[PDB]
Design an enzyme around this catalytic site. Structure first.
Site, PDB file in Angstrom:
ATOM      1  N   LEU A  48       0.801  -1.228   0.000  1.00  0.00           N
ATOM      2  CA  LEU A  48       0.000   0.000   0.000  1.00  0.00           C
ATOM      3  C   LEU A  48       0.833   1.278   0.000  1.00  0.00           C
ATOM      4  O   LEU A  48       0.503   2.196  -0.740  1.00  0.00           O
ATOM      5  CB  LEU A  48      -1.102   0.007   1.063  1.00  0.00           C
ATOM      6  CG  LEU A  48      -2.131   1.157   0.944  1.00  0.00           C
ATOM      7  CD1 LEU A  48      -2.665   1.368  -0.498  1.00  0.00           C
ATOM      8  CD2 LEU A  48      -3.290   0.881   1.879  1.00  0.00           C
ATOM      9  N   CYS A  71      10.446  11.777   3.796  1.00  0.00           N
ATOM     10  CA  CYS A  71       9.924  10.610   4.487  1.00  0.00           C
ATOM     11  C   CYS A  71      10.888   9.392   4.318  1.00  0.00           C
ATOM     12  O   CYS A  71      11.362   9.109   3.182  1.00  0.00           O
ATOM     13  CB  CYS A  71       8.535  10.324   3.864  1.00  0.00           C
ATOM     14  SG  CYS A  71       7.912   8.696   4.118  1.00  0.00           S
TER      15      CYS A  71
HETATM   16  C1  LIG Z   1       6.177   2.593   6.647  1.00  0.00           C
HETATM   17  C2  LIG Z   1       4.796   2.159   6.162  1.00  0.00           C
HETATM   18  C3  LIG Z   1       4.027   3.345   5.593  1.00  0.00           C
HETATM   19  C4  LIG Z   1       4.971   1.099   5.066  1.00  0.00           C
HETATM   20  O1  LIG Z   1       3.655   0.641   4.679  1.00  0.00           O
HETATM   21  P1  LIG Z   1       3.463  -0.669   3.914  1.00  0.00           P
HETATM   22  O2  LIG Z   1       2.147  -0.524   3.163  1.00  0.00           O
HETATM   23  O3  LIG Z   1       3.628  -1.755   4.877  1.00  0.00           O
HETATM   24  O4  LIG Z   1       4.741  -0.596   2.913  1.00  0.00           O
HETATM   25  P2  LIG Z   1       5.045  -1.581   1.643  1.00  0.00           P
HETATM   26  O5  LIG Z   1       4.263  -2.809   1.839  1.00  0.00           O
HETATM   27  O6  LIG Z   1       4.923  -0.747   0.412  1.00  0.00           O
HETATM   28  O7  LIG Z   1       6.579  -1.936   1.849  1.00  0.00           O
HETATM   29  C5  LIG Z   1       7.036  -2.586   3.035  1.00  0.00           C
HETATM   30  C6  LIG Z   1       8.495  -2.249   3.211  1.00  0.00           C
HETATM   31  O8  LIG Z   1       8.473  -1.116   4.026  1.00  0.00           O
HETATM   32  C7  LIG Z   1       9.794  -0.964   4.481  1.00  0.00           C
HETATM   33  N1  LIG Z   1       9.680  -0.163   5.718  1.00  0.00           N
HETATM   34  C8  LIG Z   1       8.992  -0.434   6.837  1.00  0.00           C
HETATM   35  N2  LIG Z   1       9.179   0.572   7.710  1.00  0.00           N
HETATM   36  C9  LIG Z   1       9.973   1.485   7.131  1.00  0.00           C
HETATM   37  C10 LIG Z   1      10.478   2.706   7.534  1.00  0.00           C
HETATM   38  N3  LIG Z   1      10.080   3.228   8.701  1.00  0.00           N
HETATM   39  N4  LIG Z   1      11.416   3.401   6.715  1.00  0.00           N
HETATM   40  C11 LIG Z   1      11.914   2.885   5.413  1.00  0.00           C
HETATM   41  N5  LIG Z   1      11.108   1.727   4.993  1.00  0.00           N
HETATM   42  C12 LIG Z   1      10.290   1.012   5.866  1.00  0.00           C
HETATM   43  C13 LIG Z   1      10.333  -2.379   4.746  1.00  0.00           C
HETATM   44  O9  LIG Z   1      11.614  -2.544   4.075  1.00  0.00           O
HETATM   45  C14 LIG Z   1       9.258  -3.258   4.088  1.00  0.00           C
HETATM   46  O10 LIG Z   1       9.915  -4.188   3.234  1.00  0.00           O
HETATM   47  P3  LIG Z   1       9.751  -5.774   3.366  1.00  0.00           P
HETATM   48  O11 LIG Z   1       8.759  -6.146   2.089  1.00  0.00           O
HETATM   49  O12 LIG Z   1      11.090  -6.428   3.238  1.00  0.00           O
HETATM   50  O13 LIG Z   1       8.978  -6.002   4.803  1.00  0.00           O
HETATM   51  C15 LIG Z   1       3.968   1.544   7.335  1.00  0.00           C
HETATM   52  O14 LIG Z   1       4.639   0.390   7.878  1.00  0.00           O
HETATM   53  C16 LIG Z   1       3.755   2.568   8.477  1.00  0.00           C
HETATM   54  O15 LIG Z   1       2.639   3.278   8.479  1.00  0.00           O
HETATM   55  N6  LIG Z   1       4.688   2.711   9.394  1.00  0.00           N
HETATM   56  C17 LIG Z   1       4.569   3.705  10.501  1.00  0.00           C
HETATM   57  C18 LIG Z   1       4.829   5.166  10.011  1.00  0.00           C
HETATM   58  C19 LIG Z   1       6.257   5.396   9.491  1.00  0.00           C
HETATM   59  O16 LIG Z   1       7.296   4.998  10.278  1.00  0.00           O
HETATM   60  N7  LIG Z   1       6.418   5.973   8.293  1.00  0.00           N
HETATM   61  C20 LIG Z   1       7.773   6.192   7.730  1.00  0.00           C
HETATM   62  C21 LIG Z   1       8.283   7.602   7.995  1.00  0.00           C
HETATM   63  S1  LIG Z   1       7.149   8.840   7.281  1.00  0.00           S
END
Ligand SMILES: CC(C)(COP(=O)(O)OP(=O)(O)OC[C@H]1O[C@@H](n2cnc3c(N)ncnc32)[C@H](O)[C@@H]1OP(=O)(O)O)[C@@H](O)C(=O)NCCC(=O)NCCS
Length: 90
Positions: A48, A71
């Site tokens: 997502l 970000c």
């Molecule tokens: C970060 C976030 C938006 C990712 O959402 P998601 O829909 O799970 O993301 P995707 O599925 O597109 O990708 C997942 C990848 O995110 C990456 N990821 C998770 N947290 C991360 C972070 N804080 N910073 C960089 N990348 C991150 C991981 O490498 C993961 O890869 P994997 O497939 O090996 O597990 C979600 O986990 C979240 O809301 N986290 C809390 C808020 C946050 O810390 N945002 C980042 C700073 S703005």
């Protein structure tokens, strides 16, 4: 996955408003700074945040706007996995 552009909240988001990428516009509307991405726990690890990023990049790209990937999702995960977007980067 329906993603919409909510200008009033400065985000691209799912229609339920639950998942989003927020920006701040800089340099008189020429630069979009991607500042915060959030996906709720039940919907994570499914791509997502990647789709949210694609919505924002496509927007920037069609409007001739460049991006600051503030970000950490954007700079640390989305860009390295999607380097064809790197020319958009300020
Ligand atoms: C970060 C976030 C938006 C990712 O959402 P998601 O829909 O799970 O993301 P995707 O599925 O597109 O990708 C997942 C990848 O995110 C990456 N990821 C998770 N947290 C991360 C972070 N804080 N910073 C960089 N990348 C991150 C991981 O490498 C993961 O890869 P994997 O497939 O090996 O597990 C979600 O986990 C979240 O809301 N986290 C809390 C808020 C946050 O810390 N945002 C980042 C700073 S703005």
């Amino acid at each position: 996955p329906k993603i919409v552009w909510n200008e009033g909240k400065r985000r691209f988001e799912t229609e339920d408003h639950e998942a989003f990428i927020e920006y701040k516009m800089r340099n008189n509307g020429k630069v979009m700074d991607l500042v915060h991405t959030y996906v709720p726990s039940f919907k994570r690890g499914l791509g997502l945040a990647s789709h949210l990023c694609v919505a924002a990049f496509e927007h920037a790209s069609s409007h001739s706007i460049s991006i600051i990937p503030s970000c950490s999702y954007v700079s640390d995960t989305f860009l390295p996995r999607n380097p064809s977007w790197k020319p958009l980067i300020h």
